[PDB]
Design a protein around this nucleic acid. Sequence first.
RNA 1: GCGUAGCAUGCUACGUCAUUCUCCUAAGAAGCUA
RNA 2: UAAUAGCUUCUUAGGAGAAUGACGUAGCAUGCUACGC
Lengths: 185, 186, 590, 529, 75
Amino acid sequence: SSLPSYAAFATAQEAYEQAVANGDSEVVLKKLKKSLNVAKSEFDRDAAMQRKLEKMADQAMTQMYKQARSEDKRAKVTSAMQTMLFTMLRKLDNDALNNIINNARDGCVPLNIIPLTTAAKLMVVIPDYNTYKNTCDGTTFTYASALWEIQQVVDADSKIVQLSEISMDNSPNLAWPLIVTALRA
Amino acid sequence: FSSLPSYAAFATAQEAYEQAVANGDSEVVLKKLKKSLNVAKSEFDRDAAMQRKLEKMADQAMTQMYKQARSEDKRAKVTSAMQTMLFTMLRKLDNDALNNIINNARDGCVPLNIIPLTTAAKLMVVIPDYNTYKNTCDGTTFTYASALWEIQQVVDADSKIVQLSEISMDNSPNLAWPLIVTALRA
Amino acid sequence: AVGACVLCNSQTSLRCGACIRRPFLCCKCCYDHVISTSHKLVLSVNPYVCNAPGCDVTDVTQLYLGGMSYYCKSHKPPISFPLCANGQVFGLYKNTCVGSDNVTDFNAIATCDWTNAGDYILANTCTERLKLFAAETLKATEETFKLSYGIATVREVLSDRELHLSWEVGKPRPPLNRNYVFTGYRVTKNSKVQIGEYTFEKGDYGDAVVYRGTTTYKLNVGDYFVLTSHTVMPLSAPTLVPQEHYVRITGLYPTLNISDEFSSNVANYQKVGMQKYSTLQGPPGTGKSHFAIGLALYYPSARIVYTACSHAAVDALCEKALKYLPIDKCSRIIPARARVECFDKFKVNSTLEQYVFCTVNALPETTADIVVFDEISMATNYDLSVVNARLRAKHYVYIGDPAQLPAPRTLLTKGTLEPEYFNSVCRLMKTIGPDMFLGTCRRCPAEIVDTVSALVYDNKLKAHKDKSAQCFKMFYKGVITHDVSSAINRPQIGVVREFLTRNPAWRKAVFISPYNSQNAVASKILGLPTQTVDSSQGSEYDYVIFTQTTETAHSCNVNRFNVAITRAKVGILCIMSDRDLYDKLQFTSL
Amino acid sequence: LTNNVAFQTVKPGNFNKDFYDFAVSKGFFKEGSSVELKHFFFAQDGNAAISDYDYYRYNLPTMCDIRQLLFVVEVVDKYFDCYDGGCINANQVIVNNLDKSAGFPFNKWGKARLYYDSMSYEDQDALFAYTKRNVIPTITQMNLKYAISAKNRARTVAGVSICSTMTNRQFHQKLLKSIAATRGATVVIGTSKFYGGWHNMLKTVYSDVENPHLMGWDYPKCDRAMPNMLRIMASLVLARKHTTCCSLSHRFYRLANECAQVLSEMVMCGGSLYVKPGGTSSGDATTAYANSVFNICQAVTANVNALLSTDGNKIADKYVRNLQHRLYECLYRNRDVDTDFVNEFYAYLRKHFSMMILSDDAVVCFNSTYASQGLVASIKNFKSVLYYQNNVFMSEAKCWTETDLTKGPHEFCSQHTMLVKQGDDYVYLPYPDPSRILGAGCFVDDIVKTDGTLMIERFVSLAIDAYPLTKHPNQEYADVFHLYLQYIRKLHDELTGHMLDMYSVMLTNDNTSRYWEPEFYEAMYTPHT
Amino acid sequence: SKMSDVKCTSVVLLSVLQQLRVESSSKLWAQCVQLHNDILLAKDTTEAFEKMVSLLSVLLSMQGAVDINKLCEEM
RNA sequence: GCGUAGCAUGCUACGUCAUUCUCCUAAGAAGCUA
RNA sequence: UAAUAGCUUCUUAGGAGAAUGACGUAGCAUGCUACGC
Ligand SMILES: Nc1ncnc2c1ncn2[C@@H]1O[C@H](COP(=O)(O)OP(=O)(O)O)[C@@H](O)[C@H]1O
Ligand SMILES: [Mg+2]
Ligand SMILES: [Zn+2]
Ligand SMILES: [Zn+2]
Ligand SMILES: [Zn+2]
Ligand SMILES: [Zn+2]
């Protein structure tokens, strides 16, 4: 086992095995068995305390890993579990959530919680004329795969604004972004 | 162990063994000196094995005494903290009305539930909805526990200040209920 | 604890020991760092010293690991192996490791002492992470060397919860910082060795200090504490966000018919709009501090945080926004120190408003929609990393001119720094050119601007003004008394004493001098409002008494002369000693 | 106390995405599945603690029948006659965990360890002897629980401070640890469900029942609707072992301290002191045992009501008609104890109404013929008793009756039981709800428990707890154990991979090989150990 | 597996909302925990899904606490 | 035939060490139930 | 902020006990040898 006392034991092995290969008699055989036993014992001792060294190192390593990974798991988790939320949210693949967060990417985020009862108020900001063109047609407003009708269009100036002037050549004239108030149909 | 005089005996016996090995004396002399070496080993190994457990128990008693000293030092700190807390709460007491109601008593014993009912200078009402606000502390003054209290402050569940004109029937949904109004005895 | 390597970003746990900042270092990278430089100490999760009862062999290529401890050559176990073998240093994540050739610049970065003028050049052309490490160790070395410490000793031990302190009179004292450290210096005969690493926060009663130590040894009577080494915050954000080019306007909402004054820069507000970060360069007094307000009134619905390295620039920006932006919600942020007076006319300390005014060292960790960094001439890489780590916005605006003064850099005493090596933004605007530009002087009269339009700029800057002909050039000795290691010139303030009685239009003048001592003593002599060259950058001054004191490489630079003379909007008196600098100015000759 | 009312919420649980992905990759959580997630970590708003303390409004001042309670007390004491108890010194009281809280205001300065270390045995015995002739009113906190459950209402536990807890331990711990060290009795506390302990309990239930039938009831709002009288009775029955160590005034003052520290005292609910109308605080020193006494009382009262409410002329057994006659004359015509008849009635109850109690869960193997005739308590008798002595209604919807003895009780301690074959004979194995086990695996209450590779003991313990599912006839019930086993296998494999990447040496004695083969969990439910 | 899949998404979304200190606003936290506890106790795919939409809208209204654009190109 | 001394074997007692198992206590981590 | 009680798993440390094996010392018995009687 690559130790000097292992060399003592290995030479006791060779010597007394050769003696048994002769094996005649008797006194040298018994005395050599005694020497083999004492070499066995003195090797056995530091082999066992070597056990203790590697297991003490098992404390060292296991404590080491547990504590490091402890605030390894703490430091990442907040942003990392936001990433988990988005990966696992994206795994759902529901057209309502897809529509809603692809509208959130362009800046069309709602200003309050989306109500679920019929005919309840939702206010969401419109950041572009293209975003208005895609979602609002006529006086209707499609969002979260749902139908909404318009109560407000209103701009950043908080000036009461009406529905017709939002057009191709009149769009830069608007005070962007616009805030819509809608009810659910 | 390695400092014991029996180690010196074992060492001189082993030195004698190696000197006789270098000398190659008779078998009887070698056997006698081997007997001496073996009895030296039997003495010293036993004594060192005794001293090992002695070191173990010494360390155990040392650890127990160290822990007991730290326990005493924690006991002093918690005693000081408790004394300071008690004396500060004494400094918070309203001694005049308390003395009045204790002197009014026969035995000097009064129920605990009426100590704040008759001596507390500041009152807090926790109000879950608007109807209870209209029923218990409408306006700037109200009457509870046979006294007159004036509302000094109104805070919502988020500890934000709410002015008394903000609490209306139509404006109730915009408030973070419950409301914690704070009043003083007048 | 584990970490990431500097020059390869691999997982590792081997800190270097003799590097000034105590960084995290790799396996092969650390082998190359300790095999080529004088740094020999390496900090794993446990230090790499020998574990004999008495032995000091801290070199890593030199020990052996047997069992679970570190042993020297003399105290080695029969079964062991050396730490530095096979080209790596023994540590965690051994074969999950990759190296690089960034050690050729890393060795020079970690080895230099930052008093030369070539290491500053090296610290601005290499990769981004080595740039960040070089800036971090620059700040650390500055804090070690300049304004170092005063010797302190402990008289007696009251307890382990509260300590006794005794400053040595004759040297100043650094205050509490957990970032600061006072290394134990029982230096007598008798173990002139680190006995630990300490910081000191003072109590409100008696003569006591409640310390925080990182060692388990009681104090000796002769143990001392002198502040050697400092730990600055290990920032992570790059000096510059990577550029991304846009096609249409994103995140911003323009206005039609914004005003009359900003109508010339509307195309400029677009080009700010469809870039991630844009840079503006212009000679002083051309409207760089005006372009931020132009951006504000071109993008009204978006929050903009306005921040600069100093307080004078953010206060001039406060003034211009005070005349052009709505007063109702505008902001201003002062730190918890509150050392100096600020522009206290808006809301002070309101981080949730649309126009936030602040200084780089005191920004809150919030978002924005446009960030406008003013006067990068005061900005180092540390300040850029601070504003990148704390402010998180769609658009970055970098306005400034390298021809004005760079950062102090008090370690820099030899060599000369080019304007393109002040920081990364200067390297951008001088190498590939600024995105957009203005040069036309509306501040100093035609005479003095024609003088300065040959020294720093070679005739690319005209003016729209008159030669008012009160730019008086005077040449005298001005005997120099060297009192406080800052120049004081009593005869210079004397010729100025008696050349103020002859001029009735100069009683409102402002005294300017490149030396703070004479600058300050000029207050009681002649009573004019009094400012230095460094702190007068940004505000416009009617009459200026500039007084160049000495002949050296400190006060005779053309840049500080440029900023000191160009703040006189109608007239200036300049005092002098030089002859190369007097040969090229076009002033009235006296 | 403080100037603003504190609102305390409950955070939601923390998702273990690795475990859930491994589960859904193994054919779990479909439609048409008999096993889906039903135990979650429900969150609460800021009005949780105050709206859960409001449930004490269900506790009405209840005047119990006194001529019948004074005999149910004797029957309960006969049920509690095998054990021994008394007062013990401060050096004999043993605490299980010292890092637990110490109530108010002692939580401001440290845990309970500070108060067990700062106080010697001498001034601990001094305090205990002070409580035997003095009354110490006590503030008890209400702590919101962060634990997995199947319904959304917030559960609260009452945190009793250390001053009451230490004295109550010194008073009751001898009896409380004598109960938890006896096997084969009515109150099964301290008996494991492992190593064939469930089978032993369930065969001690079936000890001389004539025509066996299984029954188990449920107390709605058990800890908040109990009358003060039944709690005082439980405290007195638990204090009937101090007939040698304690005097009479000492026992009365100990009962007064228990009522002043447990039953009706000031309750702290978010920095505010209220008044507890009554019922047990479920965090004192004697809660499972006192609740067991209460449950045995309700069972005996139901039996007495069923026996007296029977007609009498319809009584076929002529002895038990005489037994009912003697029961009435010992209830409403005697003022002293009739120990002979108390022994006879207790033997009758143990012969026809064998029970098994752990603090609110009872499995009864009552006589079916006598119950059909009406001579032992049935479901309707318990409903009436809970109506007029507990001020709650016991609906049949959550109380079961099992007519087949080969499948055991429907539910005891939230563990369904079934008859399996082990070796050559048949034993009963308790299997939990697999939804509960899957919810515990999927929803951890911390971030360090999400990574998995740090904690193999969590999944080993869960596999130990859910081993009996393999012997269930339904296959995807049995698939949970193999899911957990393969998860432990993968977890160990990737832990070894990570510790091979973060070092260069692979663990010399990696001892984990037995955790992913079923011998370690099969030996858990064998009666040898 | 579409049903046991939403019930965990509500848990992680409420954890993220608690991370961004919606807990400091009692009024908003009210329907945040309301929708969370109602989605956990759901039977059909629908009401689970637009209650999911309503609960995610809380995270949607938040300009600076989230930055929506990073957490959805690389995934 | 006896004694002393020496060697070999067997047995007993004691001292030490290695291996395995059981228990008793302490500490720590975790799970389940009421 | 995080209660009482019970059960179970795992890890360490210490003690005690048991069993097996090895070495050393002492005692008893058998066989043999040297010398003396
Ligand atoms: N287009 C303009 N029309 C009139 N005055 C201007 C115009 N642009 C700038 N100014 C004036 O010039 C000054 C420039 O100040 P500042 O922005 O500090 O210059 P710089 O930043 O280039 O040093 C402002 O005070 C402003 O009043
Ligand atoms: Mg300017
Ligand atoms: Zn170094
Ligand atoms: Zn590296
Ligand atoms: Zn050494
Ligand atoms: Zn007693």
